[PDB]
């Protein structure tokens, strides 16, 4: 009934605009986004929207965009986000663009308190964010207040300590100075290597109840399912890795986890609505497929990207060593000039 279907897609660092047709599929829109930004490791990603009832939802790529209850507005608003997380960033985020998108999203969740982080880890993470953004600490340029314009720490860390912004800056600067010589893209990777070991990293939590009506959390992540106490989302009460699951299923509100081990009982929980159980199961199927895929041989495409990454890295290392050595040749000629 509108004459246009204008669409905005916001990534962690760009705003894109499209204009689609009534029969445009999720996959078609998704493919236009990733082509625009130059992303190839697309498997981790999704397009998230707000439905007409205000719930964050993933666009289904196998359905028409207009058939999915996207909040009606001009333009339609999507967030391009990592939906699935690797088991190890160093092994599995091959390309620098992939690493940057993950870094920006994870850092958002740390800073907004979504992903719990202890204070000392938050300062260490902030130091790598700073090395990436500023490069090497340089006492001629980075004076007191060089970080004053930056959101660097989780709100919980700021609120629960007594330090002022200057004291926080000095703690982060100590670490910043330790990173001198570290390439910006390497500091991004070091950030992610720390963040991926946080207890809440890469976990989707769903509110559930047991048969007695006690509130619990279900987590879904790369490695399987977990049951948590209502009041602790850090440490699972019961873990259900893939290797221990025989079947997961649902029937309206009831979700059943059937174990491989014949001695162990079924785990049953209840969601508020069928739609939630469908969301859980879809996320479990996506995760388990990626789990299996990373244990099978690399596709030809993945091999290509890995060989391109090795060659580009090898080349940049060589050019960097050449420039350092030329700088020494210059500094030598500047000082044997004076004689």
């Amino acid at each position: 009934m509108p004459k246009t279907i204008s669409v905005r897609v916001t990534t962690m660092d760009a705003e894109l605009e499209f204009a689609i047709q009534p029969n445009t599929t999720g996959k078609q829109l998704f493919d236009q986004v990733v082509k625009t930004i130059g992303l190839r490791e697309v498997w981790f990603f999704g397009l998230q929207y707000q439905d007409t009832k205000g719930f964050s939802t993933w666009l289904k790529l196998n359905k028409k965009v207009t058939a999915q209850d996207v909040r009606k507005e001009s333009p339609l608003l999507f967030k391009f986000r990592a939906k699935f997380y690797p088991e190890d960033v160093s092994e599995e985020l091959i390309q620098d663009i992939t690493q940057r998108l993950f870094f920006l999203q994870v850092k958002e969740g740390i800073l907004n308190d979504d992903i719990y982080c202890p204070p000392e880890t938050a300062v260490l993470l902030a130091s790598y964010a700073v090395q990436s953004k500023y490069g090497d600490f340089n006492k001629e340029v980075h004076k007191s207040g060089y970080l004053a314009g930056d959101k660097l720490l989780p709100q919980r860390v700021l609120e629960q300590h007594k330090l002022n912004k200057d004291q926080w800056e000095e703690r982060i600067q100590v670490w910043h100075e330790e990173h001198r010589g570290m390439l910006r893209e390497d500091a991004v990777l070091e950030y992610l290597k720390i963040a991926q070991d946080l207890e809440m990293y890469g976990v989707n939590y769903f509110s559930i109840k047991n048969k007695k009506g006690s509130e619990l959390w279900l987590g879904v992540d790369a490695l399987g399912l977990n049951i948590y106490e209502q009041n602790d989302r850090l440490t699972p009460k019961i873990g259900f890795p893939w290797s221990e699951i025989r079947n997961i299923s649902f029937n309206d509100k009831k979700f059943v986890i059937k174990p491989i081990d014949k001695k162990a009982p079924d785990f049953v929980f209840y969601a508020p609505r069928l739609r939630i159980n469908k969301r859980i199961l879809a996320l479990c199927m996506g995760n388990h497929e990626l789990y299996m895929r990373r244990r099978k041989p690399d596709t030809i495409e993945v091999q290509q990207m890995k060989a391109q990454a090795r060659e580009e890295k090898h080349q940049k290392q060589m050019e960097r060593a050449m420039l350092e050595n030329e700088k020494k040749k210059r500094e030598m000629a500047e000082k044997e000039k004076e004689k």
């Binding site: 996959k27 289904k60 359905k63 996506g286 497929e289 299996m292």
Partner: peptide, 14 residues
């Protein structure tokens, strides 16, 4: 042109 059969940007195997 809705031939992509899967919910995400990778195939689900049987």
């Amino acid at each position: 042109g809705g031939s992509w059969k899967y919910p995400d940007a990778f195939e689900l195997s049987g």
